[PDB]
């Protein structure tokens, strides 16, 4: 049984977000960032139980549904406004080389035939993609640190990272790189 305590709160959070979402489309979707293309590792953190329908399509687009997942994205003028919608449920920050290389090595999962298999062999890598210029995991590792045209498939190949929940360890520029070390 659920109380009228939660009903008023849920409708208050919904009108606050709808105003902020309709703030965002009505205003110009421009961020105070240089136009040079950069890379973001972005992590879903549970903001509110109910969810609005424009982020519903775009969170399925980032396949970011389960609790405490992460994925690597590349910022454009498009991808910024995708990020500039989904702020309260996600954390965005620039990765470092030690953080990215560990995360895939500790937790590396790939997608073939709708299955979540680990990353056990580099022969599996060539059986999966093969003809895209990649030769091992380190080829994908280099592809993350400097974005190439084939990063679109490498993001599609890579499963979302199911990290562990930390026990207490909007924008944060280096604090998310502290958050990966606390919760990996």
């Amino acid at each position: 049984f659920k109380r009228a305590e939660k009903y008023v709160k849920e409708y208050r959070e919904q009108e606050r977000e709808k105003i902020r979402l309709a703030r965002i489309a009505k205003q110009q979707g421009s961020f105070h960032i240089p136009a040079e293309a950069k890379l973001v590792f972005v992590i879903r953190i549970k903001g509110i139980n109910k969810i609005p329908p424009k982020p519903r399509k775009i969170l399925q687009l980032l396949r970011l549904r389960q609790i405490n997942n992460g994925v690597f994205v590349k910022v454009t003028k498009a991808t910024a406004e995708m990020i500039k919608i989904v702020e309260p449920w996600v954390a965005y920050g620039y990765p470092n080389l030690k953080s990215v290389r560990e995360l895939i090595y500790k937790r590396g999962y790939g997608k073939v035939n709708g299955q979540r298999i680990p990353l056990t062999d580099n022969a599996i890598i060539e059986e999966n993609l093969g003809k895209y210029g990649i030769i091992c995991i380190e080829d994908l590792i280099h592809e993350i640190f400097t974005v190439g045209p084939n990063f679109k498939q490498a993001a599609n190949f890579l499963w979302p990272f199911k990290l562990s929940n930390p026990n207490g360890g909007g924008n944060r520029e280096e604090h998310i790189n502290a958050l990966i070390r606390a919760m990996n």
């Binding site: 470092n96 080389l97 030690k98 790189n177």
Partner: peptide, 22 residues
């Protein structure tokens, strides 16, 4: 002694500097 900035940047074996005398 070691540098956290070098270790974070990925020095691994390179961040650890060893001094012969105390």
């Amino acid at each position: 002694k070691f540098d956290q900035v070098k270790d974070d940047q990925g020095a691994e074996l390179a961040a650890f500097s060893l001094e012969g005398l105390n």
